[PDB]
Structure formats: structure tokens, C-alpha cells
Amino acid sequence: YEHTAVMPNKVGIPYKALVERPGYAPVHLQIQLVNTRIIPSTNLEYITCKYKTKVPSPVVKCCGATQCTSKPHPDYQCQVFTGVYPFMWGGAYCFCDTENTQMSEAYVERSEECSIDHAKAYKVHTGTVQAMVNITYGSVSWRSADVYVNGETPAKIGDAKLIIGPLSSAWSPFDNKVVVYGHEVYNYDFPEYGTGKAGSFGDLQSRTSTSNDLYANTNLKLQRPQAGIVHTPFTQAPSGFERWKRDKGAPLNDVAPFGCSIALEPLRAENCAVGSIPISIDIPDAAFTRISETPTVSDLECKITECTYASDFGGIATVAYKSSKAGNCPIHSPSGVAVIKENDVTLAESGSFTFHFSTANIHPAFKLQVCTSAVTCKGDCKPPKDHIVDYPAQHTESFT
């Protein structure tokens, strides 16, 4: 009646659940926990991205009391160098014998890639919790609707009134503080934004892609420009971006438990193959198919005349039912332990009539609770090969 259904929160699997009832006829659902949703409140702490030593032009005080001063976009790594008597077309512009110093300054500054396709940290607050739940029916055909699990709407959306979550993916499998760089998610913790840690993630910490305040040391170390002429050597360690796709840490869209792959996310782990959303529906009795407008199935037998089997969708088995009543008949192997092609198939009394389903078997001996009364619906059929294909259409696995 009030059809509980928990399944793994797995994106691409239509688990085709069954309301077991005897007041009215059992009616099919599909409690398909499509797409792992997580989405809490977040805070952009700092973008990281591979450097660009976009020199602010070296503030040079060549002699006497040195100054590298302060100009817009603070934080400048600045180092005096001597043994130079520079050239740039004409003669030296640093030249005293009280110093003979030419003061090179270089800071790390956001690349153009920081703007678009970039590592992006967050200190992620506990916030909200989200789910996405398909409910089909043995009357209604599909709705795959986003459903909240926090204080906003953990009630009715689409068919039936549905109470959602808590998820096992209420937080991402990745850490509280998370970096995301494209598809690839890198879990890295830091307390909050400020002045980071060089030669590791958050060695560049710009609040955003074009900014004033930042942390500009990707292990940027200026060195002496030999030969008595000045340029500015940049000795720099790989940033949290260069590391994260070719000097990668942990690529969470391939190593986050469950079955997750990820996009750019605040802290969400899309496409996880568990993260189970326990769905519970309060179905009004009216929405059902009546038990007298279905066969109250009796004389259950399954056979075939000819058959071919399919574990995606197309698995068949004729049924010699000679039921006490006759009518329409929603079918499902109880509570998302089968994938049924159909929502509802009519089944009468006398003769043999195939229905469609799909299961984690190669021949159809999956029980099917055909609008009252389960039966393993054997038939010789023919083996399919159909398992190279994506996330299941063979439920949570439970047969051959």
C-alpha cells in the first residue's frame, strides 16, 4: 500500500518496484534513484589554476635605500640581484658601487585558464541535502524529479506523496573541503582562505580569476640573471591544476566510492552507483488498479511456446494463467529487484500471454508478482549478451 523502496542511488537503472497490496491490486512503480544529488551550501574560498608569471614590472630601486613598494594587486615576491650592469637596448639602469643591485620582482598571477576550466576550492558548509527520485507507476508513466531531503520539501513531488532520504550520499564521498577541476574532483583540505601553502594545492590562492588580493607563491623563486644583463628567472613548482590532470592526486570521478563521476560541483558527486535514497510513498488507494479490475491471479503457470531472453529489456515469458478474475495487471518482481519493460501488462484467465521484463538472469526465472501472486516465470528462451552496456537495467543484481 504505502510502498517503501530503497535501492542503490544509481543513476542509470530503472528499478521497477512493486506495491504489494491485497485491498487493491498490486501496482508497479519504478523507484529509480536516478542521479546522485548531494548539493550542500558551499563557499568559494579560492580558485587555483596553473600560474602565469604576469610580472607587475619589477619595482627597481638600484642604489641606496631599496624599495619594491606596493602597487595594485598586492603580494609581490621581490629579490635584489647584483653582479648586473643591465642592458635592454641601451646601457645600464642599475649601476652604483654603493650597491649595484637591480631589483627584480615577480608575483604569481592568475592565468587565463583561471577564468575558465580551473581548479576551484571550497570550504563546504553542512547545508542542504538533495536527492533525485523517479517514481513510475502501473498506471502513470515516469517522472524523474528532483526532491529535497532537508527542511524544504521532503514531501510530494510528482505521482504519490513521497518522503525522500536521508541519502548515503548526503555528503560526497570526497572530503569536507573539495577542489574540483573540470570533470576531475580532487579532495584536499585547508581550514579557510588566507595565505596558503606553497608547492601543494592552494599554492596559488586567488579569491577569484581576476582579483587584487591573492596568495602568490607557487614556489616562485627568483634567481640571479647571469651575464650582467637582467631578465627575471621564474623557478616554480607545479600548481594545483598541473597537478590535477597530469601530475594528478586522486581523481575522484574515478576513485570516489559508489560509482561516481563528477562535473564542476560545489560538493556533489554525480552519477554515484549507490548513495541509496530510501523512498517511501503514501499512495492514495484511488491511484491503484483495483484487484477485481486485475486478475486476482490464480492457476499460475509460466511456459513459453517460443522465446528469446534479454536482460536489458525484452525478456519474455508466456503465462498460462487461468485466474479467478481478469483485467489489467501491473507486474514486477517485488520492490526494485527487477526491471520491467512495461508498467502494466494485461493478463487474463485461460490461454497464455507473454509479458515483458528484464532481470539479472539469462533466462526468465525471476519471480514476478503479477497484480497479486508471485511466480518464477521460466521459459527456455535464448541467452543475451547484453551486459557490455552501462548502469544496470537488471536491477541491483539477484539472479543468474
Q: Which positions lie near a copy of itself, rule CB under 8 A? A: 41, 43, 123, 125, 127-128, 149-153, 190-197, 205, 215
Touching another protein, residues 369-398 (CB under 8 A): 376-398
Q: Decide: helix, strand or coil at residue 156.
A: coil
Long-range CB contact pairs, 141-147, < 8 A, 24+: 141/343, 142/30, 144/32, 144/34, 146/37
CA 366, CA 21: separation in Å to the nearest integer? 20
**Which one of another protein, a copy of itself, none is in contact with 153 (Cβ closer than 5 to 8 A by kind)?**
a copy of itself
Which one of 20-28, 193-201, 288-296, 303-311 is the stretch in contact with another protein (CB under 8 A)? 303-311
Q: Select the residue interacting with another protein from 26, 40, 196, 364 (CB under 8 A).
A: 364
Residue closer to a copy of itself by CB (options 171, 399) is 171
Torsion over CA: 51, 53, 59, 62 (sign): positive
Phi, psi of 329 (to 5 degrees): -155, 100
Please, which residue, 282 or 380, has the CB nearer to another protein? 380
Q: Which long-range contacts (CB under 8 A, 24 or more apart) does 147-150 make?
A: 149/277
Comparing CB distances to a copy of itself, the nearer of 32 and 205 is: 205
22 CB burial (10 A radius; 0-12, 13-18, 19+): exposed
**Binding partner of residue 191 among another protein, a copy of itself, none, CB under 5 to 8 Å per kind?**
a copy of itself
How many other CB atoms are found less than 10 A from the CB of residue 198?
19
Among residues 62, 57, 163, 61, which one has the least CA distance to residue 109? 57
**Peptide linkage before 233 cis (omega within 30 of 0):** no
Which of 45, 46, 179, 184 touches another protein by CB under 8 A?
184
* Cα–Cα distance, 68 to 59 (Å, whole number): 5
Q: How far is the CB of 43 from a copy of itself (least distance, A)?
A: 6
Which of 35, 217, 359, 369 touches another protein (CB under 8 A)? Answer: 359
**Residue 164: half-sphere exposure toward Cβ, Cα within 13 Å:** 35
Between 169 and 289, name the residue whose CB sits nearer to another protein.
169
Q: What does 48 interact with, of another protein, a copy of itself, none (CB < 5 to 8 A by kind)?
A: none
* Binding track over 50-89 against another protein, x by CB under 8 A: xxxxxxxxxxxxxxx--x-x-xxx-----------xxxxx
Q: Shortest approach of another protein to residue 342 CB, angstroms? A: 16
Q: Which amino acid is at 361?
A: N
Nearer to another protein, 202 or 327 (CB): 202
Within 123-162, which residues bind another protein (CB under 8 A)?
Answer: none
Stretch that binds another protein, among 20-28, 141-149, 193-201, 332-340 (CB under 8 A): 332-340
Decide: is 314 part of the binding site for another protein (CB under 8 A): no
Q: Which residues contact 231 (CB under 8 A, 6 or more apart)?
A: 225
Q: Which is nearer to another protein, 72 or 151 (CB)?
A: 72
Nearer to a copy of itself, 72 or 151 (CB): 151
Interface stretch with another protein, choices 35-43, 111-119, 324-332, 348-356 (CB under 8 A): 111-119
Residue 105 is classified by DSSP as E
Residue 112 DSSP class: G
Handedness of CA 309, 361, 254, 148 (dihedral sign): positive
User: Which one of another protein, a copy of itself, none interacts with residue 89, CB within 5 to 8 A by kind?
Assistant: another protein
Q: Which residue in this structure is represented by grid cell 602565469?
A: 52
Q: How far is the CB of 259 from a copy of itself (least distance, A)?
A: 29
Which residue number, 19 or 60, has a Cβ lying nearer to another protein?
60
Near another protein by CB under 8 A: residue from 12, 127, 199, 314 = 12
**Residue with smaller CB distance to a copy of itself, 41 or 67:** 41
Q: Which of 156, 233, 348, 349 binds another protein (CB under 8 A)?
A: 233
Q: For residue 289, what are the CA distances in angstroms to 72, 227, 337? A: 72, 90, 21
- Tell me, by CB under 8 A, how many residues bind another protein: 144
Distance separating alpha carbons of residues 35 and 162, to the nearest angstrom: 17
DSSP state of 290: P
Determine the 3-state secondary structure of 287 from DSSP. Answer: helix
Extract the C-alpha cell encoding 21: 497490496
268 binds another protein (CB under 8 A): no
